[PDB]
Amino acid sequence: GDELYRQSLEIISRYLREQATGAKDTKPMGRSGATSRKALETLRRVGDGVQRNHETAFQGMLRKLDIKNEDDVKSLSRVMIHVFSDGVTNWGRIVTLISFGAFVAKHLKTINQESCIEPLAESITDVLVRTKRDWLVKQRGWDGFVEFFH
């Protein structure tokens, strides 16, 4: 996974954390950090409407999952894979995956389970990169993500 994986995890966990708490890391990267910031800016921008517009499907999804603990979060992978894989793959679908992650993360802070946010982000990244690796590489990874939403 390397650089695409490292970059994806950094963006998605920071995004899920900011959405739940606070917030800001104000922390280094400091890697391919120009790309990461821009992607974090666009995701913050694009993620905006998406959460609101799907407040209904999201709420429906959330009740249906009944997430209460760390063991619950660790079993979401295949349901994630089931809703996300088969179809058109495009950046809107990817932002919906991550936006729902943020939605779940906020719920996690609500039931006082902020500690599950990080394994949640890790799980989402693992699903994003394993099911969409070749599409992602083809789109210039996160650099391309910004252009589609400029």
Ligand SMILES: Cc1cc(OCCCc2c(C(=O)O)sc3ccccc23)cc(C)c1Cl
């Ligand atoms: C079960 C789950 C699914 C996730 O995203 C699936 C892909 C995005 C998506 C859809 C899609 O790809 O069209 S429809 C839909 C409805 C509710 C929530 C998300 C969603 C994302 C997470 C974090 C979890 Cl836990």
